[PDB]
Amino acid sequence: KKRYIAFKVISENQFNKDEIKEAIWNACLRTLGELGTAKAKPWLIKFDETTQTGIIRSDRNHVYDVIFSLTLVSDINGNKAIIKVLGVSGTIKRLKRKFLSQFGWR
Questions:
Q1: What span, in angstroms and rounded, lies between the C-alpha atoms of 39 and 18?
Q2: Which residues form a coiled coil?
């Protein structure tokens, strides 16, 4: 009933767990609304501050809404940056496989 989506952030500067975590939230709030966010249940399970890579969990039926929301992220904390998804997947090991493992992940 859950899905994990891997993402990388393209920016001039670095960002910390707390920062992108907040951003991911406001993104769903603006785009999906309080109700939408409630249904999507977006959770930031892990974010590698070194490689600006991370994983997000969401309801199986709202994956593309969380993606749609993250894509509209123009800047994050005053610093221009865009965040793009690398791919969705059933389990984390399976996701951490086909996408992250080829970054500093295992």
A1: 23
A2: none
Q: What is the CATH number of domain 1-106?
A: 3.30.70.3250
Residue 13, both tokens: 């500067």
Nearest alpha carbon to residue 24 among 80, 68, 79, 88: 68
CA distance 63 to 33: 15
User: Among 66, 68, 61, 29, which Cα is nearest to 44's?
Assistant: 66
Token match 């965040």: residue? Answer: 83
Q: How was this structure determined?
A: X-ray
For the chain, the farthest-separated pair of C-alpha atoms sits apart, in whole angstroms, at 36
Question: CA angle 43-30-88, nearest 5°?
Answer: 40
